[PDB]
């Protein structure tokens, strides 16, 4: 009849790293032999043009700062000069068994947790969450900056049983937007597949390929690697790009972040769009956190209002709580300290 001190969920909707290839459009049905986009280095010189402080206003102290440029080595990934199309493929697996914790102390809390998850599922399917997870696959939101200013984006999704293609899909990723979730016909079959993968026990494997027509020789944007120890010699690059065996790649957690942006249910954002699903719902680009404990909108508060004292939220908040179970997460409340 209280929150367990250990409570953890495991990641359903688990993608892989997204490798990058490059070739021509209209040779993209036969794109299995396209060479990879490789990461190379270059040099870059610029002037320090940042905001000055208040204390120094003088032409001599500013002109002496631009006598000396600074230099640095960065990484760059480009398409080849004869290729205009970026190919990005990754494999998604939708596991299922969603509301079952991978850790729980109290047997009573697990017993009145999986019953509440069942009376979510038996009263309404995963179809509302499944349409919004499948919509972020059907528009190529996992192409982050590779999507913006592309001429045509084309997404191909293949369900795979053992080594065969059970059903294939095909989408125009620009024709469906990023703001408003709409209902389609070829897309609801994919939504039903993802829902039947989340509801059952056993994985559903997808391969997702996106083709973005960008232009000859243009710059593509793989994910950038975070290094906390910077080399103290003057040797090191200033910008390192992620690469899976000499192929430029996007991280799996960044693809998965792109798939989780379904949260449109906090009573704000008349023109922001979806944000990702997080406890204490926070955006790293905006800097803030939109679901605060001062308001009845947090996972740590919505969850134990809906489980312990069976005070159900609104249905739109229940969708958030179940989506926040599908991403996983480690949770506490710490019965002993």
């Amino acid at each position: 009849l209280s929150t367990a001190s250990v409570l953890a969920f495991e990641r359903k909707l688990d993608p892989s790293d997204a490798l990058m290839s490059a070739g021509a459009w209209a040779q993209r049905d036969a794109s299995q032999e396209w060479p990879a986009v490789t990461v190379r280095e270059k040099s870059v010189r610029g002037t320090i043009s940042n905001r000055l402080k208040t204390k120094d206003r003088d032409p001599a102290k500013l002109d002496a700062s631009i006598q000396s440029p600074n230099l640095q080595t960065v990484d760059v990934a480009n398409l080849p000069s004869d290729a205009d199309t970026l190919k990005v493929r990754f494999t998604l697996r939708v596991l299922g068994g969603a509301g079952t914790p991978s850790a729980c102390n109290d047997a009573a809390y697990r017993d009145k947790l999986l019953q509440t998850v069942a009376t979510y599922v038996n009263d309404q399917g995963f179809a509302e969450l499944a349409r919004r997870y499948a919509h972020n696959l059907a528009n190529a939101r996992f192409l982050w900056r590779n999507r913006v200013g592309a001429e045509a984006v084309e997404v191909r999704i293949n369900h795979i049983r053992q080594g065969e293609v059970a059903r294939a899909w095909r989408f125009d990723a620009l024709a469906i937007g990023l703001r408003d979730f709409k209902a389609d016909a070829e897309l609801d079959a994919l939504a039903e597949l993802i829902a039947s993968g989340l509801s059952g026990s056993g994985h559903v494997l997808l391969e997702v390929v996106a083709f973005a027509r960008i232009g000859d020789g243009q710059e593509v944007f793989p994910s950038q690697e975070l290094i906390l120890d910077k080399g103290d010699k003057k040797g090191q690059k200033s910008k390192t790009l992620y690469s899976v065996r000499d192929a430029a790649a996007i991280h799996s957690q960044k693809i998965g972040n792109a798939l989780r942006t379904i949260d449109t249910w906090y009573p704000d954002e008349d023109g922001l769009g979806p944000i990702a699903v997080e406890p204490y719902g926070s955006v790293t680009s905006q800097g803030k956190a939109y679901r605060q404990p001062k308001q009845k909108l947090d996972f740590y508060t919505l969850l134990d209002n809906w489980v312990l004292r069976d005070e159900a939220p609104a249905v739109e908040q229940q969708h958030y709580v179940i989506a926040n179970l599908i991403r996983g997460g480690v949770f506490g409340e710490a019965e002993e300290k």
Binding site: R51, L52, N70, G231, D232
Partner: protein, 68 residues
Amino acid sequence: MKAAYIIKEVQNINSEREGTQIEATSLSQAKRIASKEQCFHGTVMRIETVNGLWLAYKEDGKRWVDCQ
């Protein structure tokens, strides 16, 4: 004694830029007079010897990260 240092103001940590030579007694005096003599906001201060060995650096409102 007064030792010679090179104070550099760069964009990020792994940038090369010609710096200005100071005269300071200790490394803490160099960190104090490298706290000032900084013109810009989003820049990194770096303290070096006269031959190019790094000593400490500071990245836009953090601690001085000493270089062992």
